[PDB]
Amino acid sequence: GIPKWRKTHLTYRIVNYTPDLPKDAVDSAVEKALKVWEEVTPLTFSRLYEGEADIMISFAVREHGDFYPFDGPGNVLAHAYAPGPGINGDAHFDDDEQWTKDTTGTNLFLVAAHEIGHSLGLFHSANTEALMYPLYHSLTDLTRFRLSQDDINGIQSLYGP
Ligand SMILES: N#Cc1ccc(-c2ccc(OCCC(=O)NO)cc2)cc1
Ligand SMILES: [Ca+2]
Ligand SMILES: [Ca+2]
Ligand SMILES: [Zn+2]
Ligand SMILES: [Zn+2]
């Protein structure tokens, strides 16, 4: 049990969107990913807009010169930060892509959950069922979407024993 600077309560701000799908696809994705860890660990969060919350989810168009420029439908889908004094819980999404919620391309629901897991304080796992797997695993079977002992131990180290 050792979370972000020992803080149990984290705030998140939506500063990203999707040019292809409705706002429910992006806003609810951030919250579902954010609360997917709430449904697994006793973490407390709040969604606001002030200026900059603990976790800042922003969009990144082709002018993405902070790590990698736009690649289009390329494997590079997004990047996030976590153990930092400023970049604490901050991520970016490739706006120039097909963001879907039904694995029809770039599943932002799955990617966001993976990015939120990162920002919360986790890296990459090894199990194929793990939400933090370092390789694209777009599965049409959304009924099998779950957490596994692999990623579980990771989030457990953050907010658990
Ligand atoms: N169940 C399940 C499950 C579902 C999806 C993934 C999945 C998809 C794309 C990814 O792309 C973003 C690149 C990255 O690693 N960023 O930090 C990484 C992970 C894994 C497991
Ligand atoms: Ca891409
Ligand atoms: Ca931040
Ligand atoms: Zn970036
Ligand atoms: Zn990752």
UniProtKB/Swiss-Prot annotation:
Ca(2+) 2 binds at D54, G86, N88, D90. The active site is at E115. Zn(2+) 1 binds at H64, D66, H79, H92. It is found in: Secreted, Extracellular space, Extracellular matrix; Nucleus; Cytoplasm. Keywords: Calcium, Collagen degradation, Cytoplasm, Disulfide bond, Extracellular matrix, Hydrolase, Immunity, Innate immunity, Metal-binding, Metalloprotease, Nucleus, Protease, Repeat, Secreted, Signal, Zinc, Zymogen. One of its GO terms (cellular component) is extracellular space. Ca(2+) 1 binds at D20, D95, E97. Its main location: secreted. Coiled coil: none annotated. Zn(2+) 2 binds at H114, H118, H124. Ca(2+) 3 binds at D71, G72, G74, V76, D94, E97. GO terms for biological process: cellular response to amino acid stimulus; cellular response to lipopolysaccharide; cellular response to nitric oxide; cellular response to reactive oxygen species; cellular response to UV-A; collagen catabolic process; extracellular matrix disassembly; extracellular matrix organization. GO terms for molecular function: endopeptidase activity; metalloendopeptidase activity; metallopeptidase activity; peptidase activity; serine-type endopeptidase activity; zinc ion binding. Directly cleaved by HTRA2 to produce active form. Metalloproteinase with a rather broad substrate specificity that can degrade fibronectin, laminin, gelatins of type I, III, IV, and V; collagens III, IV, X, and IX, and cartilage proteoglycans. Activates different molecules including growth factors, plasminogen or other matrix metalloproteinases such as MMP9. Once released into the extracellular matrix (ECM), the inactive pro-enzyme is activated by the plasmin cascade signaling pathway. Also acts intracellularly. Belongs to the peptidase M10A family. It is linked to Coronary heart disease 6: A multifactorial disease characterized by an imbalance between myocardial functional requirements and the capacity of the coronary vessels to supply sufficient blood flow. Decreased capacity of the coronary vessels is often associated with thickening and loss of elasticity of the coronary arteries. The conserved cysteine present in the cysteine-switch motif binds the catalytic zinc ion, thus inhibiting the enzyme. The dissociation of the cysteine from the zinc ion upon the activation-peptide release activates the enzyme. This is Stromelysin-1. It comes from Homo sapiens. The gene is MMP3. The chain holds residues 105 to 265 of 477 of the full protein.
